[PDB]
Amino acid sequence: TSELEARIKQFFITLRSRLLRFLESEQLSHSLSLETLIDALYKINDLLQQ
Amino acid sequence: PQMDLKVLSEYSNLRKDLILKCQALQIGESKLSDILSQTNSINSLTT
């Protein structure tokens, strides 16, 4: 059971880490960054300059 | 809207820059229409 307690504790580690790295993947696709927005605004500035 | 605070200052500076861009765009469009009407009157007089 002591060899079993390490596996079931590592199972809950590898579950919630795979869960939260999935949750941050779906959230950041529905959020915005402060780099791509500035890149798009650079493009808009270039277009309005032209 | 308006708002690592250095990139926040850079974003607000770019926002003010783009606001000045569209302001100057509207001003230049109206002034170009006025100049075009003026030179249309001048071309009518010369013809």
Curated annotation (Swiss-Prot), chain A:
Which keywords accompany this UniProt record?
Cell cycle, Cell division, Centromere, Chromosome, Coiled coil, Kinetochore, Meiosis, Mitosis, Nucleus
Picking any one GO biological process from the record gives: attachment of spindle microtubules to kinetochore
Q: What is its main location?
A: nucleus
A GO cellular component annotation here is: Mis6-Sim4 complex
* Subcellular location, record wording: Nucleus; Chromosome, Centromere, Kinetochore
Role, per record: Component of the kinetochore, a multiprotein complex that assembles on centromeric DNA and attaches chromosomes to spindle microtubules, mediating chromosome segregation and sister chromatid segregation during meiosis and mitosis. Component of the inner kinetochore constitutive centromere-associated network (CCAN), which serves as a structural platform for outer kinetochore assembly.
Q: Which family does it belong to?
A: Belongs to the NKP2 family.
Other facts noted in the record for this chain: Present with 1630 molecules/cell in log phase SD medium.
SUBUNIT field: Component of the inner kinetochore constitutive centromere-associated network (CCAN) (also known as central kinetochore CTF19 complex in yeast), which is composed of at least AME1, CHL4, CNN1, CTF3, CTF19, IML3, MCM16, MCM21, MCM22, MHF1, MHF2, MIF2, NKP1, NKP2, OKP1 and WIP1. NKP1 interacts directly with OKP1 and AME1.
* Name of the protein: Inner kinetochore subunit NKP2
Q: What is the lineage of its organism?
A: Eukaryota, Fungi, Dikarya, Ascomycota, Saccharomycotina
Give the gene symbol: NKP2
Of the intact sequence, the residues represented are: 54 to 103 of 153
UniProtKB/Swiss-Prot annotation, chain B:
Superkingdom as given in the UniProt entry? Eukaryota
Task: Report the sequence similarity comment from the record.
Answer: Belongs to the NKP1 family.
Q: What is the annotated quaternary arrangement, including any partners?
A: Component of the inner kinetochore constitutive centromere-associated network (CCAN) (also known as central kinetochore CTF19 complex in yeast), which is composed of at least AME1, CHL4, CNN1, CTF3, CTF19, IML3, MCM16, MCM21, MCM22, MHF1, MHF2, MIF2, NKP1, NKP2, OKP1 and WIP1. NKP1 interacts directly with OKP1 and AME1.
Q: Secretion signal: which residues?
A: none
Which residues of the complete protein does this chain represent? Answer: 121 to 179 of 238
Q: Where in the cell is it found?
A: Nucleus; Chromosome, Centromere, Kinetochore
Function text:
Component of the kinetochore, a multiprotein complex that assembles on centromeric DNA and attaches chromosomes to spindle microtubules, mediating chromosome segregation and sister chromatid segregation during meiosis and mitosis. Component of the inner kinetochore constitutive centromere-associated network (CCAN), which serves as a structural platform for outer kinetochore assembly.
The molecule here is called: Inner kinetochore subunit NKP1
User: Per the UniProt entry, what species is this protein from, by scientific name?
Assistant: Saccharomyces cerevisiae (strain ATCC 204508 / S288c)
